Design a protein around this ligand. Structure first.
Ligand code: ACO
Ligand code: ACO
Ligand code: BTN
Ligand code: BTN
Lengths: 182, 507, 179, 148, 91
């Protein structure tokens, strides 16, 4: 009551929807429970109750009944949507954000998921591996114990171990290399 | 030439600012202009520009030349809305004299600072400056002082958010120290007082621009910046989302928004998160994400002081602040860095009527001379003070360890808390069984036999609960339901405190 | 000590003291002679920015009499941090040896005349005009320039008339110090 | 030239204000100067002058000339006592640009207005002016608004 | 108690006292109930209780007993004083 809020009168949402390697032009408008969406000239009508908290969202698209799951959302437009069992990555920007985003530098960093370092100083009490051992994503590799706590270090890469640099009984600090994957 | 022609010519120049060639370079470096940044931040069409025709009045050192007469004098100021909610903004334009601060520059920013305080609307600044404009001399120093005075006056009255979108040097680097949150853009923004040129000239140390004041340094090591975002477009998209959490003024209650997440659902996933073995760590974030509405959590300083987690979330539509321990890092112990981040967050949320939820799992304090000589005592008092003086709802749940003085520091009930829940795995004691029993039975025979009896009686949450320290012991799966119930009845809470000119925080 | 520069440790001790004295209605007297901030990675990585804001905040929010005298240097942002008049100060005196500037003559002139010939000749003119307390005083930054021998008399006069000072501030549940 | 010499030279000019010949005319007309009026009004020795070294910053229309640089910019401001009781005063000096009001002129008067309100002391003004200083234009109009 | 008042430390009052057509140089100092007044080099001591409301003011000047009446006073220094029956105008 102190600060009136005025809902923007947005009649049309102009979106740039990037899939794998294509960018599609999509314009949507709301008519209540149904969104009228033009996808590169094709007219679709998506009707739902749009309960945004449920893990299962039931939609009807031009009479076709679909069930989809939204697994993650980011403010930057990234959405992870499971459609017919497969997770698709879509980046939805507004027209303005997409037009200006072209001015950003395409910097690329290195993925160093094969280099497993100690997150915490202490003594190494277990190593689950030797070179050649299979490693799954999330697999425990090393356990380092200090401050009456065992800090389990897991792999971020599937593969086999190339080298084990620190053994049980060794003392390691923060940032020291424990195991190197292939 | 008619007056209308002159007006149109000034409008066209104000939009170009420093000129098209400068704008071209602005994009080459990977940066947006000050006006493009505002268009992204605010609701389309909601922005109204003020004082677009103001120019500097300095005539010395050639400043009277027509080539220096840039309408707008390096800042874009005005008002708008984000999702229908009133907000004031300003953005510094680097293409006009390097974004340096003039007398008139500050004046325009102060004007926005005064309107926002009077009506009670947040101010979001987009900072990018090369420092003081030396051609005017001491006029720019008064500019900084007036801005600083407004930033202090607005504290606890309206939220103040500062997003850094480029380099910042000289006196300008202190405004984010007075606002509530500071955000940066990775590899684009800097915060320093003097550049590497001065460090090399004064002392025999070798440093580059990124090492001295880059975004990675301030979000990972110094604890100055609350979060860095990858680029300009993502930074403003996340800023809109962050804005939606906060009230417009401290006179307003925490905002409540439409929510589809049933408030009475259970979370069975919690019953097995906490191991029975005391030396096994777990990820506190798994608990936070499962309790909060629709599993959305906004984490602050993800890479700094990782042993304590603070951030924003909603429960049943209402914005709440969450503080908790992270047992994975340094056993969940308190240290200097964690106390600084915690106290700052708690105090902001209290000032703007945002309830606090505390997830306690803390075995004590980080030992060692690194902390003793660092003033761990003086710094730990900051977090205890921030909780003890709070007047907003405080809901504490203890998930496992609470040993020693850390029990009270992490918002215990005897600090005017509202409710305090324990999970069956909680243990509240002055210290663990080993220390307590060897000290109690010091020099006695059959200490291990006495320890077995001690553990059976005291290694559990009951000797504290039966004395009134804990209100209930709940199945972890019900945690969300219990918190939701408390938040919706403590929201009308009001308390009185003795009058004091101001608070006296231990510092 | 350290040329009179501000650093992390000095800001912590200063802010704490200023805040106590303000809370219990004890007037403040400031003796300014500060060339800037202590440079170096030891301070940058230590949060010198976050910590320096503590002393600026402690002075800016003060409501008790504040009497500042500048005895010599006041360069850069340190001028305002050390309780400058534009932070709701009551009086600000300079001694004839005071110099108020964004930076010293060397930095200011080489930056202003960057790439120009006869910079040293321009520096001589710059020093004669700006290396003194006058370009600040004529703009209202300084109330008077006093013979140092009279400092005590001037302060005593101000304290005995500012003691009845009362000001108002917008209501706030509590203050929000930068920490 | 040392800084102390420059300071002394500014002090001497601030006391003369518009100059001795103007002061002579001031007396010929039967008027006292702004500083003589304050000395009569306030308890002897109680007056403390503020901002005596402030000068205008206008450079247009020849205002940058040394001949126009009058320390004090046509007002004498400060504080004192009458019979032991605190009072703030200001007095406009007609001998400097006719006593016309500049931006800086008003600023100094406003400064006195703010200190007096904060402590709770009366303000006594001695007014004498030819109106706005047209060389600055709209700066003097803002001056009036702030005083009002 | 809010605004302390400090009595000026005036040790000597230097006055210019105009009578009919002459201007005299008078310097006075207070020593309590008695004023020590030098009138063009002559030393006089005026002792009284100085009750300023009474129509009759009794003074003793160097042992000489006088009664005077102050009939009017102005801020500009004008005073009308009756001395030995005659009203004298002094500024
Ligand atoms: C002690 C104190 O706290 S006061 C600090 C005083 N600060 C300053 O005066 C500025 C600090 N130092 C600098 O000038 C540095 O160059 C910084 C901080 C501006 C950073 O430099 P960069 O980000 O590389 O910008 P850079 O200086 O290259 O920009 C060049 C342009 O900006 C403008 N510019 C740069 N520095 C300044 C400055 N200090 N004042 C005014 N304009 C400036 C110039 O007009 C120049 O014009 P161009 O477009 O023809 O090149
Ligand atoms: C519509 C409105 O409300 S705005 C009103 C606009 N009116 C004005 O500007 C003021 C009215 N007109 C005048 O200027 C008249 O001359 C008045 C009111 C100043 C009265 O004039 P006088 O009392 O005779 O002073 P006079 O003008 O003779 O003084 C002469 C000196 O004063 C100065 N002076 C006089 N008028 C002005 C002025 N308007 N602005 C600045 N300086 C002035 C001159 O420098 C001049 O210098 P000198 O010493 O070499 O002579
Ligand atoms: C074994 O050496 C005992 C370590 C102490 C346990 C932890 S570490 C820091 C906290 N302080 C304390 O007394 N207990 C906690
Ligand atoms: C010579 O190398 C210049 C040293 C800088 C002078 C001092 S040291 C720290 C303060 N910062 C600054 O810019 N000036 C001051």
């Amino acid at each position: 009551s102190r600060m009136p809020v005025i809902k923007p009168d947005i009649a049309n949402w102009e979106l740039s929807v990037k899939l794998h390697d294509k960018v599609h032009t999509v314009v949507a408008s709301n008519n209540g429970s149904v969104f009228s969406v033009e996808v590169d000239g094709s007219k679709l009508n998506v009707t739902s109750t749009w309960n945004l908290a449920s893990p299962l969202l039931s939609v009807s698209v031009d009479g076709t009944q679909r069930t989809v799951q939204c697994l993650s959302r980011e403010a930057g437009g990234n959405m992870s949507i499971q459609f017919l069992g497969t997770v698709y990555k879509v980046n939805i920007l507004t027209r303005l954000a997409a037009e200006l985003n072209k001015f950003m530098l395409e910097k690329v960093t290195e993925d160093t998921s094969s280099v497993l370092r100690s997150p915490m100083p202490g003594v190494v009490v277990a190593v689950s591996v030797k070179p050649g051992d299979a490693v799954a994503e999330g697999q425990e590799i090393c356990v380092i114990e200090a401050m009456k706590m065992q800090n389990s270090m897991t792999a971020g890469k599937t593969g086999t171990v190339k080298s084990v640099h620190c053994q049980a009984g060794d003392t390691v600090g923060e940032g020291d290399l424990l195991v190197e994957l292939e | 030439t008619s007056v209308n022609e002159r007006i149109e010519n000034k409008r066209r120049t104000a939009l170009l600012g420093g000129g098209q060639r400068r704008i071209d370079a602005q994009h080459k470096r990977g940066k947006l202009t000050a006006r493009e940044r505002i268009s992204l931040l605010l609701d389309p069409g909601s922005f109204v520009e003020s004082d677009m025709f103001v120019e500097h009045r300095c005539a010395d050192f050639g400043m009277a030349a027509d080539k220096n007469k840039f309408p707008g004098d390096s800042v874009v100021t005005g008002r708008g809305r984000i999702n229908g909610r009133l907000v004031y903004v300003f953005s510094q334009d680097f293409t006009v004299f390097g974004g340096s601060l003039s007398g008139a520059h500050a004046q325009k920013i102060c004007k926005i600072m005064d309107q926002a305080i009077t009506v009670g609307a947040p101010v979001i600044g987009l900072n990018d400056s090369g420092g003081a404009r030396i051609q005017e001399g001491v006029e720019s120093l008064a500019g900084y002082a007036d801005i600083f005075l407004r930033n202090v006056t607005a504290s606890g009255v309206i939220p103040q958010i500062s997003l850094i979108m480029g380099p910042c040097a000289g006196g300008a680097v202190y405004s984010p120290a007075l606002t509530d949150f500071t955000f940066m853009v990775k590899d684009t923004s800097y915060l320093f007082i003097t550049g590497p040129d001065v460090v090399k000239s004064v002392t025999n140390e070798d440093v580059t621009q990124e090492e001295l004041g880059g975004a990675k340094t301030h979000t990972t090591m110094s604890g100055v910046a609350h979060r860095a975002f990858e680029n300009d477009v993502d930074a403003l998209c996340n800023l809109r989302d962050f804005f939606n959490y906060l009230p417009l003024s401290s006179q307003d209650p925490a905002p409540v928004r439409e929510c589809h997440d049933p408030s009475d659902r259970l979370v069975p996933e919690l019953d097995t998160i906490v191991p029975l073995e005391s030396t096994k760590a777990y990820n506190m974030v798994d608990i936070i994400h499962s309790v909060v509405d629709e599993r959305e959590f906004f984490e602050i300083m993800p890479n700094y002081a990782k042993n304590i987690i603070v951030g924003f979330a909603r429960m049943n539509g209402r914005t709440v602040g969450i503080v908790g321990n992270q047992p994975k890092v340094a056993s969940g112990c308190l240290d200097i860095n964690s106390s600084v981040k915690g106290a700052r967050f708690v105090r902001f949320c209290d000032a703007f009527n945002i309830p606090l939820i505390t997830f306690v799992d803390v075995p004590g304090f980080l030992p060692g001379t690194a902390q003793e000589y660092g003033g761990i005592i003086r710094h730990g008092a900051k977090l205890l003070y921030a909780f003890a003086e709070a007047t907003v709802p405080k809901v504490t749940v203890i998930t496992r360890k609470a040993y020693g003085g850390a029990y009270d520091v992490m918002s215990s009930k005897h600090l005017c808390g509202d409710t305090n829940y324990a999970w069956p795995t909680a243990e509240i004691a002055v210290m663990g069984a080993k220390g307590a029993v060897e000290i109690i039975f010091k020099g006695h025979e059959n200490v291990e036999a006495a320890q077995a009896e001690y553990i059976e009686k005291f290694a559990n949450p009951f000797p504290a609960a039966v004395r009134g320290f804990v209100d209930d012991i709940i199945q972890p799966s019900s945690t969300r339901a219990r918190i939701c119930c408390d938040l919706d009845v403590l929201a009308s809470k009001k308390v009185q405190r003795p009058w004091r000119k101001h608070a006296n925080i231990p510092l």
